[model samples]
Target: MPHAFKPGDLVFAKMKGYPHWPARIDDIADGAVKPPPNKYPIFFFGTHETAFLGPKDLFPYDKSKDKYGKPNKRKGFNEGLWEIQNNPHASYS
Candidate 1:
């Protein structure tokens, strides 16, 4: 069976080839890259909480770090278009 998802939808999946790790569907990309077989489009998810929605690889768990290295203490996600546009490497682009 193929997987389907949408924004704010609660769904979990064991990352392919990494059965021990599970992730939640955080955002659905309309034009995002899809894996081979092209069965379903690739979606963004989080293995841990972050300042904004992004790939799980960006953050690594650290007991010495905060709450699994989660940026739980940061402010909201409304930085602005300028912040995003000015940074060529911003993932949201």
Candidate 2:
């Protein structure tokens, strides 16, 4: 199966009923046994912690604004090295 994410790629985890926390792909887990079909064992570090997660838990970082018009913040999570955009604008045709 194709790799879903690569090292140095920035991503996020979509928590149910909560804001997403950004994480950088660190590396793919090494193992003799291949993970089940359509599943990737990824090692990543987020703003608050590091973890091994599957594709279903990962998402590309979205630079969109929150409903309050302020830069989006992770629900109860502290900010890390990743820079948050200020006054982000929209795309136009």
Candidate 3:
């Protein structure tokens, strides 16, 4: 089955032994390497990892039913895995 997601689309991916997390389709592997039958090679934004997922393993992210089925106002990079924080120097001696 052809993948329904394209580059720059936010999707939900469920890897084995891990909970479903929000991911962005940074790029879709072209003919550089043929993917397995009915599978797609999806490159995520934050991590240097390419995932091979079937249609069932991937779904379009719905803001109304965001991660873990909770409504989330934040989208994309702000929604999954980890967050970056900026803090000024503080001394605790």
Candidate 4:
């Protein structure tokens, strides 16, 4: 696609078999693999509910639900291979 997107660019993403579920371009990462302890490798953008930063061609998937329906979080990245938990208070340790 010749790197057509940039940071802050409002764009939509289309998934296979689910063309109606579109999301905005969050961020574009510039690495080759995800950081340590992460499930996926660093491809090009870091996605979020609002915006992301990474590569221009790679479209990161969002697993959160909007006003439509629940996101298909079980289909990408680890894909039932692992578990992820967000604990900002260090309660698990």
Winner by TM-score: 3
Q: Supply candidate 4's per-residue lDDT for 11.
A: 27
List the global CA lDDT of all models.
Answer: 0.29, 0.45, 0.50, 0.29
TM-score of 3: 0.53
Order candidates by TM-score, high to low: 3, 2, 4, 1
Tens digit of per-residue lDDT, candidate 2, span 1-93: 445576655556554574555555554437544445555433223244455556677776553223222335554343332232321111111
Worst 10 residues of 1 by lDDT: 56-65
TM-score for candidate 1, please give it: 0.23
Native-structure RMSD, model 2 = 9.4
| TM-score of each predicted structure versus truth | 0.23, 0.45, 0.53, 0.25
26 Cα displacement, candidate 3 (Å): 5.5
Expressed as tens digits, the lDDT of each residue in 27-72 for candidate 1 is: 4357855433422222223224212222332222121223222232
| Candidate 4 per-residue C-alpha lDDT over 1-93 given as tens digits, one digit per residue, 9 for 90 to 100 | 344544333222433453223233323257633333312122111132222233432343333223323345534322211112222112111
Which model, 3 or 4, shows the larger TM-score? 3
Residue-level lDDT of model 3, residues 1-93, one tens digit each, is: 545666555566667865555555544336567668777665433343567777677766554234454334444433343311111111111
Looking at candidate 2, what is the lDDT of residue 40? 46
Which candidate leads the pack in lDDT? 3
Whole-model lDDT for model 1 versus the true structure?
A: 0.29
User: Where is model 4 more than 4 Å wrong at Cα?
Assistant: 1-3, 28-93
